[PDB]
Amino acid sequence: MKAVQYTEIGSEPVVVDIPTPTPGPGEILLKVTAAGLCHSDIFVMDMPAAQYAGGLPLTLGHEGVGTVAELGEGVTGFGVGDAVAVYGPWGCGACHACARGRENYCTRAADLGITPPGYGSPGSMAEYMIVDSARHLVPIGDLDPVAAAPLTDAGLTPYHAISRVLPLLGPGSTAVVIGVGGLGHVGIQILRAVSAARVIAVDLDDDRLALAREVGADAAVKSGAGAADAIRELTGGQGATAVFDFVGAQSTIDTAQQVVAVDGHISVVGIHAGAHAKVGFFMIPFGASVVTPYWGTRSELMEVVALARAGRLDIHTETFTLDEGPAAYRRLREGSIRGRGVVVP
Amino acid sequence: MKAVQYTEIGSEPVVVDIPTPTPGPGEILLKVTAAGLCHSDIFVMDMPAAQYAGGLPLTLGHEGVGTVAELGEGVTGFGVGDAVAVYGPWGCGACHACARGRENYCTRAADLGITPPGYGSPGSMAEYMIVDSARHLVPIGDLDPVAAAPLTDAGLTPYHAISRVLPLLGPGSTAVVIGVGGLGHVGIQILRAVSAARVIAVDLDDDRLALAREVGADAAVKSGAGAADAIRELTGGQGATAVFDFVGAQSTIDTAQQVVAVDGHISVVGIHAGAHAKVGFFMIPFGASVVTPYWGTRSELMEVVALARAGRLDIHTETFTLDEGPAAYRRLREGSIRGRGVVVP
Amino acid sequence: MKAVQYTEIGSEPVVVDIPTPTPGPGEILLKVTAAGLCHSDIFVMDMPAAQYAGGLPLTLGHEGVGTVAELGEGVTGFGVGDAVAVYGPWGCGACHACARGRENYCTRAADLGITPPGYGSPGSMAEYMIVDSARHLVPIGDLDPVAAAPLTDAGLTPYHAISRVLPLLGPGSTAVVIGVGGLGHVGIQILRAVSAARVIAVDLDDDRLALAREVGADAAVKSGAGAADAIRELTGGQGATAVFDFVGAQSTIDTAQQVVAVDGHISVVGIHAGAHAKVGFFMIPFGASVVTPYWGTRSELMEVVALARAGRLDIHTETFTLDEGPAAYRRLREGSIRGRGVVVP
Amino acid sequence: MKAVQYTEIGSEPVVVDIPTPTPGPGEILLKVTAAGLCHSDIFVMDMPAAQYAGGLPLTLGHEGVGTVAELGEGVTGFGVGDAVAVYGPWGCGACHACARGRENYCTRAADLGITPPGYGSPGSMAEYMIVDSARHLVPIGDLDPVAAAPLTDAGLTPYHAISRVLPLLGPGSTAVVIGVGGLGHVGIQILRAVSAARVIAVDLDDDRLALAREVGADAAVKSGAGAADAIRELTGGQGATAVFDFVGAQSTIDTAQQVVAVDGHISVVGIHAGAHAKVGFFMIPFGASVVTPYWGTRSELMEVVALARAGRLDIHTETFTLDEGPAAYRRLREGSIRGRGVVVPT
Numbered sequence A, B, C: 001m002k003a004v005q006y007t008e009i010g011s012e013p014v015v016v017d018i019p020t021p022t023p024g025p026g027e028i029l030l031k032v033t034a035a036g037l038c039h040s041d042i043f044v045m046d047m048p049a050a051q052y053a054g055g056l057p058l059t060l061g062h063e064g065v066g067t068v069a070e071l072g073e074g075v076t077g078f079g080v081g082d083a084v085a086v087y088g089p090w091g092c093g094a095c096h097a098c099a100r101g102r103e104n105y106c107t108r109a110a111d112l113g114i115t116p117p118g119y120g121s122p123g124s125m126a127e128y129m130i131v132d133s134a135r136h137l138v139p140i141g142d143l144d145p146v147a148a149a150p151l152t153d154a155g156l157t158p159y160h161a162i163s164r165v166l167p168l169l170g171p172g173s174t175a176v177v178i179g180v181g182g183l184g185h186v187g188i189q190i191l192r193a194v195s196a197a198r199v200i201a202v203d204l205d206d207d208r209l210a211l212a213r214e215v216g217a218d219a220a221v222k223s224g225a226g227a228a229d230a231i232r233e234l235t236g237g238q239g240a241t242a243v244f245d246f247v248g249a250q251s252t253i254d255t256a257q258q259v260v261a262v263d264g265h266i267s268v269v270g271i272h273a274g275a276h277a278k279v280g281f282f283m284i285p286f287g288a289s290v291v292t293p294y295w296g297t298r299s300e301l302m303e304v305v306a307l308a309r310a311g312r313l314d315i316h317t318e319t320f321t322l323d324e325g326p327a328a329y330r331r332l333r334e335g336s337i338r339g340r341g342v343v344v345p
Numbered sequence D: 001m002k003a004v005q006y007t008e009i010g011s012e013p014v015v016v017d018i019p020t021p022t023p024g025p026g027e028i029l030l031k032v033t034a035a036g037l038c039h040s041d042i043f044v045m046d047m048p049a050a051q052y053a054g055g056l057p058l059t060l061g062h063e064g065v066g067t068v069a070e071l072g073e074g075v076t077g078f079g080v081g082d083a084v085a086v087y088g089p090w091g092c093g094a095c096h097a098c099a100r101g102r103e104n105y106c107t108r109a110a111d112l113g114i115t116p117p118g119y120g121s122p123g124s125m126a127e128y129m130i131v132d133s134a135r136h137l138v139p140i141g142d143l144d145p146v147a148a149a150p151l152t153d154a155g156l157t158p159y160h161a162i163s164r165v166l167p168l169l170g171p172g173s174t175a176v177v178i179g180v181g182g183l184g185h186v187g188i189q190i191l192r193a194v195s196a197a198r199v200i201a202v203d204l205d206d207d208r209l210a211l212a213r214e215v216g217a218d219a220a221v222k223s224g225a226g227a228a229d230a231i232r233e234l235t236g237g238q239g240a241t242a243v244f245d246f247v248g249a250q251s252t253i254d255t256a257q258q259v260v261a262v263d264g265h266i267s268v269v270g271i272h273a274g275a276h277a278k279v280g281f282f283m284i285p286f287g288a289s290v291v292t293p294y295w296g297t298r299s300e301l302m303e304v305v306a307l308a309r310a311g312r313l314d315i316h317t318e319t320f321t322l323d324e325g326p327a328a329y330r331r332l333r334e335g336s337i338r339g340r341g342v343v344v345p346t
């Protein structure tokens, strides 16, 4: 089968031909219908060899949807042909976090060598993929696969980040979304669906500010040195109840600390090596919590799928073939994908 | 009346003679029965003149209990002689935060010039004190005033900090308390009363580790370079669900980041100028939130008083006269008060 | 001044001429700009003399907006001319519930003889009205008074009912609204603004089912014997996550028990003498909680006002003069007001 | 193997000899070390034939602990000899409730024919038992099995009931526990461990009031017509923040409605056919919620085990052999077991 793989440190990924896998006991083989590209793939491919823990070669793609092609020995709960999304942050399934579906926060996965598809286990950027267990599949019914693939991370990750503090986001609240990319353009829409927060989008690119308004942001403002003042002009001196930073550069985290309200929240979702919030007296308002969330929970993925099925999420995509995979990653690097890139095998 | 006041920048506080105040409309005059000394008073007195916002002169003391001496015009809900604790973090009473009793997070207090007793308004370290409004008094009944004074901050502040994340502290959880001083020795006892957390206390001083065990800590660890490893030996590689840092030095915040669990919490309660948690990917576990909480809420103070009335709080105190006020602050500076210092006028 | 009063048991209310009141210390005199009629007024007027606790005569109206006309002695925080909504369920202000703004659940109001405007204290159906305290006023700015009056109860009560279980109403959930009257037509809109619940409205009257669709209900079902089956056809055998019963007749409560989901909720908001849910094994699903909520909290009223200011609430009204007050109550009795009746003095 | 079974409608359970089962793919065979008796077993055995859905014959026992004896095909995550408690309210594992561990509230179990051990599937009152899946086992380490068996229901059910409203139970709150039996005597102890609530116990039997005080109740009062006034004398006119009714008779539910506070809670945990709270205006205070909870969640069982491991739960038991199973059920019927009855297969 055709697949897109990261094969050597510092190089671009390449299209390869590798055997179509066979599902062992408990496993499910999916025929992949859509595979999302994520900026985390770029972060992973830019890690030095000392840090990189994905293994070589690695089939990329941690945003996967498909149809059940083959059931491994003893697998029940799905039939051949069922359309399914892959729950990505695989955990042990047995610890206190996993028992609540919070496999993203599994305390045993490292020790047991459990790694996610697309970063240690083979991903969805291939014609077929193996899923380890039935509990890592969620039905999507007749959802269009191209718009469904991003739900698994571009949807799930912002959904989790927002869910952590949703009780803060009542009528009268403001939520700032920094970075209107794959994650951010879905995060705006989640905020509008599950809260009455006023949503203010922030991006470097004027076309992405237009995208923000298209998907329901109440205002959209230019990122950089003037952003904090511009957000404060919109909120008055109260600031923003919550800031969801999907960039996570030092400059954006600084903007976040300069606009967050007393008893508010900053979610540092975007990943930039070394960047961090500085949480201390006189550097941040009283009561303003900060976290780096990771991916999301099993029940959250089901909720994201439910939002998509109800028509609440308009996922902006561009479609690529497997052969165009490497080219698509270059597009993502240069910032020329409006929304989410999706490979269709 | 006799009072203890901060009268010039960089100097020690002094005992003074100043007029006994008279309550205006809405105000209550208390005869003070006990006034707690807090390390925040030392922080305030060490601020350079540019930063210091308490006004000069300032009657110290933001931990106050007393008996109602005189009712100002139109005050109902209290009789002369009623024993009461003073709710300290005064707010506007009208904003969304204040309507929930969360006057510690009042968004209008700065703009309206509303300042707490002992830092902008006259404190409790005097024979009498004015309280601005009846909603800032909580009845204590027959509670001993000396042990009750610390409830207003040494009790309230840890109570608030713990309350922010109480749902995390289930059976099987661990809570670390760094700094077994006024706040910390009460925080251990709150944790034991309102959660099933295993409590690990951390202090530089072996006698304070003994105090920790006396008030119900399950374990005690010497602070400094070995603390993180020693806490991890006690928790296993999971780490501590929550860390309540009542020191807040860079070294203790670093220890906190090195031991906090995935999806855990660090509460940076203690104040050291410039110290901060560094909340960023690879610098803190996934999902581990961090906050600097401030004081507490009206309903929390009532709950703290209820804990004291139920016998759940053993407040360790040393008593001083008003004339001994300055000497007591020197004792607090040098770390020679075992628990909380309390002035009795 | 002109007012509408209930003056004898079993009779219709009458237009009267009574002195314009003068505000005592702490009180505020409002010039009333709009006064809502509520079906609770009919319930109150139909009570036998043994049960009725409103006093005679009673100025009706517990849904009041106005402009500040006169400040009583010592009142600050409002200026003459300020547009304000009246928080109705007056409490003592000092107990644990009141400290959290939850004066609807005040434990001391009965003992202290504190009664709400329109049921023990004089209501808003008059040219002027007294409010006991500044904390019972919430600013509305330039909101149209006619559409703002209903926010104080038709908005607040459903808002509170929904808020009690809002975490249940995630994507994929269903909320049933029984009774599309004053409260119910606002409840549909709150559900749409603060949750991703699919909303199914239930009413006896086809025109009210049309109103339900006009304000955003996803589906509409005829009430009565077929309603349970019709709701289940829409939800599948899972049933409805939450049922907000704004009728509260035995028949509607029975419908609610027949459609509620496992681990769901029934809020019995509407009042019919003797009607009750029967909460016991085999009579209701496992985990499905039931409550009779009362009015709402101070912070909730602020949130409702915030929803109105953001354009999320389209309040359907019909306007009446004070002279038409009694006629308007007859209209409400017969079910001929489409939404909320509002008296404008 | 020896087992205790319900074999015909209206009859007492009997000791039988039936084959030792073999685990199929995904299943685990446990050697049972302790099996708790629960009053729900009596409720089930008293159902008329039209209502009874447990199947015949039925090996009783939904409170089970054991050691892993045999792993079915493909089972990982447990070794032979591991000491484990059985999570009882089996669900589909795939629905929104099950994904959160809330298999007690599974929306698909009925449709798929998934039934719990001891009520549709074979229970733990036997020398061996099959568990359907590894996710229904929780490790207990070196916990004494006799005191551990009750954690699976006598612990889990009150724990769940309390957990639903734990944020209400702050300092200053009062929690009433009606019925100091298997569930109730553990519920008192959970309340003391996870909240600062003042605990008031209620029972018909003075010896059970003594038991209540022994395990940390702040007060213990006689059930029946005078109980509501006696509880109100202890709380003042505020009433009780929460009432956990582990009897669930109409009389106890009525007591609960008469003492619950405004914005409080009544958890109707005990099962009496036809009994119900009447939730309506003027019949209950404003804001006082009422629910019938069912069993508990996966993460809750882990928390209960953690409480036991920390020394927070003193489980009062009496031990019986498998041969004494039927006699033990008669003891439970007559109210003569002080705490929980536990069968230890030899």
Ligand SMILES: NC(=O)c1ccc[n+]([C@@H]2O[C@H](COP(=O)([O-])OP(=O)(O)OC[C@H]3O[C@@H](n4cnc5c(N)ncnc54)[C@H](O)[C@@H]3O)[C@@H](O)[C@H]2O)c1
Pocket (backbone or CB within 6 Å): A037, A038, A039, A040, A041, A043, A153, A157, A178, A179, A180, A181, A182, A183, A184, A202, A203, A204, A205, A208, A223, A224, A246, A247, A248, A249, A251, A252, A268, A269, A270, A271, A272, A292, A293, A294, A295, A332, A335, A339
């Ligand atoms: N926390 C997690 O679990 C997790 C999961 C998935 C992705 N991520 C991270 O989320 C981030 C976003 O991922 P993506 O796939 O949506 O990225 P993307 O490349 O689709 O979008 C990036 C967007 O950010 C904008 N942007 C870049 N720099 C900016 C700045 N300084 N100010 C404002 N806007 C700026 C761009 O203009 C673009 O619109 C990445 O860092 C990725 O690694 C985190």
Ligand SMILES: NC(=O)c1ccc[n+]([C@@H]2O[C@H](COP(=O)([O-])OP(=O)(O)OC[C@H]3O[C@@H](n4cnc5c(N)ncnc54)[C@H](O)[C@@H]3O)[C@@H](O)[C@H]2O)c1
Pocket (backbone or CB within 6 Å): B037, B038, B039, B040, B041, B043, B153, B157, B178, B179, B180, B181, B182, B183, B184, B202, B203, B204, B205, B208, B223, B224, B246, B247, B248, B249, B251, B252, B268, B269, B270, B271, B272, B292, B293, B294, B295, B332, B335, B339
């Ligand atoms: N966030 C707020 O709202 C708030 C409110 C009140 C007080 N505070 C602050 O909380 C802190 C504690 O106040 P307090 O009055 O309890 O102080 P205290 O002087 O009574 O206690 C100091 C204690 O900390 C210990 N300690 C000092 N350095 C240490 C280290 N590196 N590691 C471990 N232990 C150490 C000492 O041994 C002593 O036991 C102060 O910084 C104070 O300003 C904050």
Ligand SMILES: NC(=O)c1ccc[n+]([C@@H]2O[C@H](COP(=O)([O-])OP(=O)(O)OC[C@H]3O[C@@H](n4cnc5c(N)ncnc54)[C@H](O)[C@@H]3O)[C@@H](O)[C@H]2O)c1
Pocket (backbone or CB within 6 Å): C037, C038, C039, C040, C041, C043, C153, C157, C178, C179, C180, C181, C182, C183, C184, C202, C203, C204, C205, C208, C223, C224, C246, C247, C248, C249, C251, C252, C268, C269, C270, C271, C272, C292, C293, C294, C295, C332, C335, C339
């Ligand atoms: N719990 C509280 O604190 C609180 C507060 C305010 C009002 N209330 C109560 O809420 C209820 C609604 O008040 P309102 O002023 O909105 O009433 P309303 O007269 O404006 O509306 C009643 C609506 O219910 C419909 N209806 C009547 N019987 C029905 C049935 N069997 N099935 C379906 N629909 C039916 C009518 O067609 C109408 O659309 C009243 O009972 C009132 O006393 C309670």
Ligand SMILES: NC(=O)c1ccc[n+]([C@@H]2O[C@H](COP(=O)([O-])OP(=O)(O)OC[C@H]3O[C@@H](n4cnc5c(N)ncnc54)[C@H](O)[C@@H]3O)[C@@H](O)[C@H]2O)c1
Pocket (backbone or CB within 6 Å): D037, D038, D039, D040, D041, D043, D153, D157, D178, D179, D180, D181, D182, D183, D184, D202, D203, D204, D205, D208, D223, D224, D246, D247, D248, D249, D251, D252, D268, D269, D270, D271, D272, D292, D293, D294, D295, D332, D335, D339
């Ligand atoms: N909701 C659920 O998921 C669930 C789960 C397990 C058990 N249960 C039920 O909980 C109940 C308790 O089970 P158990 O095994 O602990 O029972 P048990 O037989 O051990 O306890 C009985 C106790 O209740 C007392 N009692 C009886 N009637 C009383 C009354 N009117 N007032 C006060 N006390 C009274 C007895 O004196 C005795 O102390 C049963 O009804 C059982 O079916 C429910």
Ligand SMILES: [Zn+2]
Pocket (backbone or CB within 6 Å): A038, A039, A040, A041, A062, A153, A154
């Ligand atoms: Zn990703």
Ligand SMILES: [Zn+2]
Pocket (backbone or CB within 6 Å): A091, A092, A093, A094, A095, A096, A097, A098, A103, A106, A107, A108, A109
């Ligand atoms: Zn795990």
Ligand SMILES: [Zn+2]
Pocket (backbone or CB within 6 Å): B038, B039, B040, B041, B062, B153, B154
């Ligand atoms: Zn202090």
Ligand SMILES: [Zn+2]
Pocket (backbone or CB within 6 Å): B091, B092, B093, B094, B095, B096, B097, B098, B103, B106, B107, B108, B109
């Ligand atoms: Zn305020």
Ligand SMILES: [Zn+2]
Pocket (backbone or CB within 6 Å): C038, C039, C040, C041, C062, C153
């Ligand atoms: Zn009303």
Ligand SMILES: [Zn+2]
Pocket (backbone or CB within 6 Å): C091, C092, C093, C094, C095, C096, C097, C098, C103, C105, C106, C107, C108, C109
């Ligand atoms: Zn009150």
Ligand SMILES: [Zn+2]
Pocket (backbone or CB within 6 Å): D038, D039, D040, D041, D062, D153
């Ligand atoms: Zn049972």
Ligand SMILES: [Zn+2]
Pocket (backbone or CB within 6 Å): D091, D092, D093, D094, D095, D096, D097, D098, D103, D105, D106, D107, D108, D109
């Ligand atoms: Zn299920």
